Amino acid sequence: IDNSLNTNIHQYHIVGRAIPTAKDKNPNVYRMCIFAKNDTNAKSRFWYFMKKINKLKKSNGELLACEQIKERFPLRVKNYGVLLRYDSRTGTHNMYKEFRDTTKEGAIAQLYSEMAGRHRARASSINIIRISEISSSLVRRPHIKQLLKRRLRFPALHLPTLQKEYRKKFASKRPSTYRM
């Protein structure tokens, strides 16, 4: 239960094979990791890739395993690099982008948020090919490179946003945006 609120989307290891036949008595086993909102969606995404890659379809295959993946440490930061193929209005484009997070799932959430925000690209039009941990020295993006410096601080960059109780319509004196 916890008390925890925001942000959800999960990681699944799915394994499947072609249905056994007289013609082939030892089907090829195919495995993939898939980021999805649930197991049924994860199976469908696996099937879409199985259909695109192989000539296998749900009617001609069998599930060997499907199991949810949990990240090794929830609170230790890693730099995840993700390679995407996405579709524009005209056609197809490739991108490999870098995200600092404690979770691969969080990095995918940032990626979907970026693809939506910077290109107006819909979830349907994205294909994730590999998300993996990248060393600090190796990183291309300057926005991730800046985080990786020796020392970091800010004088508070964010406006207040008090609880509903204290968002009342009238104030007694003029306030300030933030303390110095």
Binding site: K169, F170, K173, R174, T177
Partner: protein, 201 residues
């Protein structure tokens, strides 16, 4: 009611939100006195607002402007007109709400004695990014030639100096009150004094 009158200092506020928030309350039934109405902000630039007002000025009833729309030039009336836009003024509830709103340029003396309040959700540097262009309504009105600003500025400075003497008097009186209060904590019962210290005052 919630309070006898809410008096609102329009300095630092953005037009739309101040009007919109007032309108829902106004419909609920509070009477609200907007003071310093000239010093409200529109979020467009000076040019952008001038352009919009010029277009508004262009609007007319071709066959007879005597029964046409009104190009209201007072900042209070501009605010009033905008609030009317946010009311169903053709209804009886709307007519009543429209009557309840009071708008005042600068600070009038029956309300200079009175307290003034502000709307924190309508403050410009709360709700508009710092680098964006903007314009004060009185300045905009002056820009499209409808200057009544210099008189208000003269009035405000005169009133503000007198007010400053009032504030120093109020502060002085509070200092003396605090001294008397602190003196008389010894004069009250110990156990009661200790209870009063324990939960604060």
């Amino acid at each position: 009611m919630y309070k006898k009158e809410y008096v609102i200092d329009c300095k630092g506020h953005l037009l739309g939100r101040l009007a919109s928030l007032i309108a829902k309350e106004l419909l609920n039934g509070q009477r609200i006195v907007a003071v310093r109405c000239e010093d409200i902000n529109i979020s467009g630039s000076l040019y952008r607002n001038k352009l919009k007002y010029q277009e508004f000025l262009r609007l007319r009833t071709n066959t007879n402007p005597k029964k046409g729309p009104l190009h209201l030039r007072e900042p209070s009336k501009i605010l009033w007109r905008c609030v009317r836009g946010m009311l169903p003024h053709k209804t009886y509830k709307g007519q009543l709400a429209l009557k309840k709103l009071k708008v005042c340029v600068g600070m009038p003396a029956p309300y200079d004695k009175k307290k003034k309040y502000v709307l924190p959700s309508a403050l410009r540097a709360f709700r508009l990014k710092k680098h964006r262009r903007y314009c004060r309504l009185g300045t905009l009105s002056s820009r499209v030639g409808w200057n009544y600003d210099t008189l208000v500025k003269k009035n405000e400075v005169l009133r503000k100096q007198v007010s400053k003497a009032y504030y120093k008097k109020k502060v002085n009186n509070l200092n003396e009150k605090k001294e008397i209060k602190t003196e008389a904590l010894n004069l009250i019962n110990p156990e009661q004094r200790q209870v009063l210290e324990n939960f604060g005052y």
